[PDB]
Protein: TANKYRASE-2
Organism: Homo sapiens
Amino acid sequence: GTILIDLSPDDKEFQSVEEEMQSTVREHRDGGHAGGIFNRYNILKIQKVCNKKLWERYTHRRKEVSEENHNHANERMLFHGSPFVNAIIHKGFDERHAYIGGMFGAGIYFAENSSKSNQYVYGIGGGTGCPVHKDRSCYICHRQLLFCRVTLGKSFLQFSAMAHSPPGHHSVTGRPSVNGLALAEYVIYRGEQAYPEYLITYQIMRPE
Ligand SMILES: CSc1ccc(-c2nc3ccccc3c(=O)[nH]2)cc1
Ligand SMILES: [Zn+2]
């Protein structure tokens, strides 16, 4: 049921998605071990992910959350990196896409910083890097990330350095408490609370 529509680089929607990607790169405490060394990306393609059934699955859940939270879904646009990006865009998020060992429990994790999600494209800790060169910092191989619509509802705030949501909450927010430049990371425990809106194909760029 999924079709992928290419956005033109001239389209305002391409441009605003690229800007969110590029502007939320930061340096990471691993010095680039997991995701590579780079300050920016070469965006090769941005596609909109269209699946009626998956969209309706998302909106149904969004309304349930909204009605439990004074008509406020608390919807965000967040990045997701994963070895399973191809299954997600065809079958939706579910328990098989969860970070079982994540610091907020087994759930599906999203980031404000695109460079955080980039660390998971080739697996946890960057796995063994690109399939072809076994390089976590490969500047040649094409990578993919998702830019997703995520319903947070009432989010449990964790001030820090599939399971269930904390009672009375719909998600967890990991607030950065040491690295003053890091943006927030979020966890949902129901695959229905996210829709994979954009598929972004890119390379990390070697700093000059
Ligand atoms: C099913 S195996 C797996 C494990 C971890 C992640 C992941 N973890 C994150 C943790 C924090 C922020 C973003 C992410 C993120 O974008 N992805 C994706 C898939
Ligand atoms: Zn490579």
In short: The helical segments are 12-23, 52-67, 85-91, 114-118. Residues 52-67 form the longest helix (16 residues). The chain has four helices and nine strands. The domain at 1-208 is CATH 3.90.228.10 (Phosphoenolpyruvate Carboxykinase; domain 3).
